[PDB]
Design a protein around this nucleic acid. Sequence first.
RNA 1: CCGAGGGUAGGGCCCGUGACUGGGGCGAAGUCGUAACAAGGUAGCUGUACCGGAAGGUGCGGCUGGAU
RNA 2: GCUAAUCCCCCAUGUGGACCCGCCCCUUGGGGUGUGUCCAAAGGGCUUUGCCCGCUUCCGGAUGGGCCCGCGUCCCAUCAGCUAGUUGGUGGGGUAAUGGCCCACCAAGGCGACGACGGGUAGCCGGUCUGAGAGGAUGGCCGGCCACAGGGGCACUGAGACACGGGCCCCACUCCUACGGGAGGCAGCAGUUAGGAAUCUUCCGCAAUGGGCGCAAGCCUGACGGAGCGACGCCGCUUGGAGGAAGAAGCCCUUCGGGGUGUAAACUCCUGAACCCGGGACGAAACCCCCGACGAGGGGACUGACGGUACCGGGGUAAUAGCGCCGGCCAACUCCGUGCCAGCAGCCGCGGUAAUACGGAGGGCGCGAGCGUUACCCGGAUUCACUGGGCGUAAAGGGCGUGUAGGCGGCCUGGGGCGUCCCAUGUGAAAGACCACGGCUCAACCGUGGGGGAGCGUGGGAUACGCUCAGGCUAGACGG
Lengths: 96, 122, 99, 137, 82, 208
Amino acid sequence: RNLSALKRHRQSLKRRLRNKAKKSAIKTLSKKAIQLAQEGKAEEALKIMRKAESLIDKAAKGSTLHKNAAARRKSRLMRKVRQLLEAAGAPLIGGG
Amino acid sequence: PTINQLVRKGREKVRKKSKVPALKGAPFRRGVCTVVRTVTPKKPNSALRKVAKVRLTSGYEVTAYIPGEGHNLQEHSVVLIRGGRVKDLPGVRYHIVRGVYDAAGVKDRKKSRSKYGTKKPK
Amino acid sequence: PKKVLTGVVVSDKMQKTVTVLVERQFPHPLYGKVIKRSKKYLAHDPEEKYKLGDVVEIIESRPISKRKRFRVLRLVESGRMDLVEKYLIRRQNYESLSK
Amino acid sequence: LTDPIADMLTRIRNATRVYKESTDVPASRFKEEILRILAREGFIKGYERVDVDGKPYLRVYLKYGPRRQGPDPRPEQVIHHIRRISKPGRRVYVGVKEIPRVRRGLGIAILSTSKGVLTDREARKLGVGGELICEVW
Amino acid sequence: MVKIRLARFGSKHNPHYRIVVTDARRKRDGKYIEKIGYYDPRKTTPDWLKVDVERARYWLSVGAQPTDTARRLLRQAGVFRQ
Amino acid sequence: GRYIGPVCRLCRREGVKLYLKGERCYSPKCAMERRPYPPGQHGQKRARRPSDYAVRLREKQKLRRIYGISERQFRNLFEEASKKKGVTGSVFLGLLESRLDNVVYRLGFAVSRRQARQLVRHGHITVNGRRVDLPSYRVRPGDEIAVAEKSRNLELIRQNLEAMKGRKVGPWLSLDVEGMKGKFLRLPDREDLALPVNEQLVIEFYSR
RNA sequence: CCGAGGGUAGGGCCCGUGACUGGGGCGAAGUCGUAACAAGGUAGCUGUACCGGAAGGUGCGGCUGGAU
RNA sequence: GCUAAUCCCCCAUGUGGACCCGCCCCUUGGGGUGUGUCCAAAGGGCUUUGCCCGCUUCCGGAUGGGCCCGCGUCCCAUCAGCUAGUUGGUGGGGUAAUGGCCCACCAAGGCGACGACGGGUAGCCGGUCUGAGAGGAUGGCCGGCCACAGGGGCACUGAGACACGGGCCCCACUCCUACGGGAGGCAGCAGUUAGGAAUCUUCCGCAAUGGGCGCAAGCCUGACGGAGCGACGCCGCUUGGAGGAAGAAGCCCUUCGGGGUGUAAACUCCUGAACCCGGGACGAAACCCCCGACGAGGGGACUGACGGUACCGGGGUAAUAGCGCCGGCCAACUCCGUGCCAGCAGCCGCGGUAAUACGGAGGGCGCGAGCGUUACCCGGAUUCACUGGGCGUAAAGGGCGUGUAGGCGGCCUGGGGCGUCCCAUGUGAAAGACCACGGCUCAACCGUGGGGGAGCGUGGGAUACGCUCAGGCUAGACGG
Ligand code: SF4
Ligand SMILES: [Mg+2]
Ligand SMILES: [Mg+2]
Ligand SMILES: [Mg+2]
Ligand SMILES: [Mg+2]
Ligand SMILES: [Mg+2]
Ligand SMILES: [Mg+2]
Ligand SMILES: [Mg+2]
Ligand SMILES: [Mg+2]
Ligand SMILES: [Mg+2]
Ligand SMILES: [Mg+2]
Ligand SMILES: [Mg+2]
Ligand SMILES: [Mg+2]
Ligand SMILES: [Mg+2]
Ligand SMILES: [Mg+2]
Ligand SMILES: [Mg+2]
Ligand SMILES: [Mg+2]
Ligand SMILES: [Mg+2]
Ligand SMILES: [Mg+2]
Ligand SMILES: [Mg+2]
Ligand SMILES: [Mg+2]
Ligand SMILES: [Mg+2]
Ligand SMILES: [Mg+2]
Ligand SMILES: [Mg+2]
Ligand SMILES: [Mg+2]
Ligand SMILES: [Mg+2]
Ligand SMILES: [Mg+2]
Ligand SMILES: [Mg+2]
Ligand SMILES: [Mg+2]
Ligand SMILES: [Mg+2]
Ligand SMILES: [Mg+2]
Ligand SMILES: [Mg+2]
Ligand SMILES: [Mg+2]
Ligand SMILES: [Mg+2]
Ligand SMILES: [Mg+2]
Ligand SMILES: [Mg+2]
Ligand SMILES: [Mg+2]
Ligand SMILES: [Mg+2]
Ligand SMILES: [Mg+2]
Ligand SMILES: [Mg+2]
Ligand SMILES: [Mg+2]
Ligand SMILES: [Mg+2]
Ligand SMILES: [Mg+2]
Ligand SMILES: [Mg+2]
Ligand SMILES: [Mg+2]
Ligand SMILES: [Mg+2]
Ligand SMILES: [Mg+2]
Ligand SMILES: [Mg+2]
Ligand SMILES: [Mg+2]
Ligand SMILES: [Mg+2]
Ligand SMILES: [Mg+2]
Ligand SMILES: [Mg+2]
Ligand SMILES: [Mg+2]
Ligand SMILES: [Mg+2]
Ligand SMILES: [Mg+2]
Ligand SMILES: [Mg+2]
Ligand SMILES: [Mg+2]
Ligand SMILES: [Mg+2]
Ligand SMILES: [Mg+2]
Ligand SMILES: [Mg+2]
Ligand SMILES: [Mg+2]
Ligand SMILES: [Mg+2]
Ligand SMILES: [Mg+2]
Ligand SMILES: [Mg+2]
Ligand SMILES: [Mg+2]
Ligand SMILES: [Mg+2]
Ligand SMILES: [Mg+2]
Ligand SMILES: [Mg+2]
Ligand SMILES: [Mg+2]
Ligand SMILES: [Mg+2]
Ligand SMILES: [Mg+2]
Ligand SMILES: [Mg+2]
Ligand SMILES: [Mg+2]
Ligand SMILES: [Mg+2]
Ligand SMILES: [Mg+2]
Ligand SMILES: [Mg+2]
Ligand SMILES: [Mg+2]
Ligand SMILES: [Mg+2]
Ligand SMILES: [Mg+2]
Ligand SMILES: [Mg+2]
Ligand SMILES: [Mg+2]
Ligand SMILES: [Mg+2]
Ligand SMILES: [Mg+2]
Ligand SMILES: [Mg+2]
Ligand SMILES: [Mg+2]
Ligand SMILES: [Mg+2]
Ligand SMILES: [Mg+2]
Ligand SMILES: [Mg+2]
Ligand SMILES: [Mg+2]
Ligand SMILES: [Mg+2]
Ligand SMILES: [Mg+2]
Ligand SMILES: [Mg+2]
Ligand SMILES: [Mg+2]
Ligand SMILES: [Mg+2]
Ligand SMILES: [Mg+2]
């Protein structure tokens, strides 16, 4: 009736927490910056947008994000913010 | 037909019609006898051929021949059947295998004994 | 190589897409005779430059939509409405094959 | 008329069977080339471009064997047998390795190739295939 | 890793291996990437070993990993000689 | 296994002596010599015309009965011949000949192939040194077929070896008495054998 | 939000079975006649129509695959 | 409530890598560059200022995959119309990635007699079986791919799963209990039961090959290696060999004289399966240990489930035969019994008092640890006919026109080169089959080498014929 598969389920539950928690944050921040960039509010958008990008690549270190996801999330994050600031300018920090 | 016609309609592979349906693709099938009686053959023969109506594991109920001289089959006699009609008893399309289940071999066969489920004598 | 095919446009009624009909011959694998068979491909035309009747080449491409896996390669001939007739009349006969 | 070639061969087969010296078939730079093989291989004495009512024909000079002994003195044929292979109803094309051996060598297969009209033997020689026009013996 | 090893052919009480390069995840007697020699352990013929040496050196360069009892039959044909 | 019963009835049915015994085969006590008519109740009845099928059966059986061989083994050889280059009829006879037990009897070590088996089977025969007790060993050119050392000293082989001293043996074979050893030189041309068999009729049997 | 499925309601196709009923095959040791085969004793066959215990008959038109 | 780390996190560092914008080369998102921003890490161990195994970010290889496209892939048209995420578009979501894969909006499209839609049946291939070939039939074992893991749905973990012996939920079923509550998923190996005409040992071992973890010793491996049962198949071998009467007994036939079984038996002699006795493997030389440098290289040793079995030697017994058939096809004939009965039978047909056709018997034919039956596949069946058939009367011309699609099409000249043909080259796995050789005493079985192929991609060529475009013609056709 036994196994260390039990062990392996025990672990997955814990990795699941760390993952979800990490991904939650990325969306919270990305959207936060995108929100700011709409009403931009350019310095702040850019400020939060950096905090996102950092957290994304941080996730791509592990099992959370495959590298190409991180790339992709970053690509779409940036595009949105920039093109949003085009409806008023101008970029107060970096970047870029 | 023209060649074009053949491109258009092709030739038709003709299917075969089994002659022992009740067998449901099996070499043999087990059954129980309902009616065990004699039947009269068509012209130009004359006899009292021995037949059993058998109810099958394959859902089907058929009349099967009882080969040999004399038998011990009666109602509720369990019996194995094989294919093969008896030309002169229409509707009979199968044979009871003598020597299997409640179908006894023929008493006192000496020739062609395997076909009659009669063991070897001393 | 990316497979390349040539055919007539039979529809322009989608936006940014044409239906290109490609035809082919081959001997009957048993009866020998050379026989024709045809097939419609939805071909990508981002430029809405291809018209009904054009004869065109299309090249197998990365998938654009469900069903569109070809972009239009180039013009070859224009104004082959006679081909488009052959197709259109055939579909119109279908109203007469029912019950 | 739907097959000029088949027509020619038949004009020939029909005439040879009642033993005409010649017969006329409507002219063509393709039919000739076939006659060029029929003569060269000795199936016909030969052909000459004639004219009937202003229109081009090929008069075809037919060849047979000796008179014979017995009740039917009709000589043997030189063209015993000639028949379309490829047709408009079904084009028949062979590659070189699959060119047939007519009548165990004693007969020929004329074929049209992209090196002109050849026999089986000749086609094998230049090593090309093509539309198998017909067979003669 | 991709591996160099011994696929058993022949038959019962009658081994005959094909020293072969295959993905480790394959089954023993399964589709292999490339054959590179053979090996009769019962030694019943003059060359109960043959090895393309020129080939085995390639795969090693490119990262193949031989089994133990294949490493040897690569020693015996001196694929390793420096 | 093989036929193993009354062997004189074979000859009588075949309408020909087949030398299936050895010694008594040459005497006037031979069955074919006394009753050259088929075994059993109706042997003396006037034969009626054999059918074509009948005819080719007998020619096949005759050839087969000569070698004491089973019908399968016979078939498998023939089929082999049909796949093998050349005239099948020749090659068939050839392959029938290359059988150990036949080779042995041809080199005179036995009076009957029926005895030439029990010799091979009881391991008294060998090839190229090594012992062979397989009545079906396909002998090739170059082979040394000898009596076993431990069998050289045996009453029966002696008696039988003594009988070969100058009787000549087929062109495809060489024999060294005293040395108790013979040699397989080549496959028999058909002429090299003169068996009472139209072997063509055998082919014809197996094409039905 | 979507969602295994559950529930309600109405449809389509297929299998089994059913008082009873329609003919069909067969059997053959019957009853009734004798429609077809001969000019088959009213030449036959025919599509259709009406009719008769039954084969069948008749009308209309057609065919010869009709004897003299 | 406490405590460790190759667990987690934070900053630092930036070869590099990621992302937005500009620019250059390219040409679908490929390669490089500039500014901006962002991301690394874990140490353990010994012979201890030097190794080994790990850790980190990047590049390229290799290998295994995802997705996409052309062509091929069964029966019913008594299934003829099907389609609203439907077909396309724009934007976004999602993924490793394209995509109606998902959503919002917009447009009105998409498919179908070249058979959509619907119903039925089937996992596909290498192959297999048959067949002269063409074809037909088939997909068991072995190899390749797919699909599934009680019936469904779902995602988590992860390079990789939507995971047979991991997780969640619903259903059906079964069991456990202390009656409160819990459990399970053999289509892994064996084994039980049901079903069935029918299909195996609850074996042995990790010695070999292979796989997982480990520096390594090594541990696990129902993969596998072997053993067990079953004549299921193929192959090999035995039940003996020689001699032995004008020829016993018995039995069968008879014209009562004899004929058969039958050299068959007896009997004589030679061999010697089984069985006894002794010895007894190949499969196993690596990993490790040695010196060298932990490499190249040379020596040390360990290890065998099968198995005390194969096999070698010595001794040694004459030692299982059965089954079908004998009217014709089809090889094998007489006597009795029976009397349209009992019965045989694949087709034609046998049996009604002289049955080579029923049953027994003698005899004979055919095969032989087999023989025969039933079932099914191809063959014979040119009886679906491409190879290779037909339609006045045998089955078969539409009741007749008109005409859509389609199929097919006169003479001459050129252009193109789609069909077609030729050369080159890639692919065409392994096994199987075919030819050679070789290893098990043969064979079967198995190994090494050889020969190719159709068919598709690529490159180059040819242009008779079919095609296509272009220009002429008048014999077809149409008109005056
Ligand atoms: S004796 Fe020899 S030959 Fe005469 S029959 Fe017997 S075996 Fe045949
Ligand atoms: Mg663990
Ligand atoms: Mg939130
Ligand atoms: Mg990662
Ligand atoms: Mg993940
Ligand atoms: Mg009768
Ligand atoms: Mg029952
Ligand atoms: Mg019988
Ligand atoms: Mg799109
Ligand atoms: Mg043809
Ligand atoms: Mg056998
Ligand atoms: Mg003859
Ligand atoms: Mg031959
Ligand atoms: Mg002889
Ligand atoms: Mg002789
Ligand atoms: Mg044959
Ligand atoms: Mg719902
Ligand atoms: Mg529902
Ligand atoms: Mg529910
Ligand atoms: Mg009824
Ligand atoms: Mg009724
Ligand atoms: Mg009348
Ligand atoms: Mg009358
Ligand atoms: Mg009348
Ligand atoms: Mg009337
Ligand atoms: Mg009345
Ligand atoms: Mg009336
Ligand atoms: Mg009329
Ligand atoms: Mg601490
Ligand atoms: Mg940092
Ligand atoms: Mg919508
Ligand atoms: Mg998009
Ligand atoms: Mg994934
Ligand atoms: Mg969709
Ligand atoms: Mg189509
Ligand atoms: Mg159809
Ligand atoms: Mg179904
Ligand atoms: Mg299925
Ligand atoms: Mg055939
Ligand atoms: Mg199948
Ligand atoms: Mg099967
Ligand atoms: Mg398989
Ligand atoms: Mg499922
Ligand atoms: Mg499931
Ligand atoms: Mg189950
Ligand atoms: Mg489940
Ligand atoms: Mg699992
Ligand atoms: Mg699961
Ligand atoms: Mg799955
Ligand atoms: Mg698995
Ligand atoms: Mg399980
Ligand atoms: Mg309790
Ligand atoms: Mg619970
Ligand atoms: Mg359990
Ligand atoms: Mg049962
Ligand atoms: Mg079992
Ligand atoms: Mg097994
Ligand atoms: Mg192991
Ligand atoms: Mg191991
Ligand atoms: Mg390791
Ligand atoms: Mg075990
Ligand atoms: Mg006498
Ligand atoms: Mg006598
Ligand atoms: Mg006697
Ligand atoms: Mg007597
Ligand atoms: Mg004897
Ligand atoms: Mg050993
Ligand atoms: Mg028989
Ligand atoms: Mg026979
Ligand atoms: Mg006979
Ligand atoms: Mg009686
Ligand atoms: Mg009598
Ligand atoms: Mg009989
Ligand atoms: Mg009898
Ligand atoms: Mg035949
Ligand atoms: Mg056929
Ligand atoms: Mg058949
Ligand atoms: Mg035909
Ligand atoms: Mg016919
Ligand atoms: Mg008729
Ligand atoms: Mg008419
Ligand atoms: Mg009509
Ligand atoms: Mg037309
Ligand atoms: Mg045309
Ligand atoms: Mg033309
Ligand atoms: Mg031209
Ligand atoms: Mg071309
Ligand atoms: Mg090729
Ligand atoms: Mg191959
Ligand atoms: Mg050999
Ligand atoms: Mg091979
Ligand atoms: Mg071949
Ligand atoms: Mg040209
Ligand atoms: Mg023109
Ligand atoms: Mg005119």
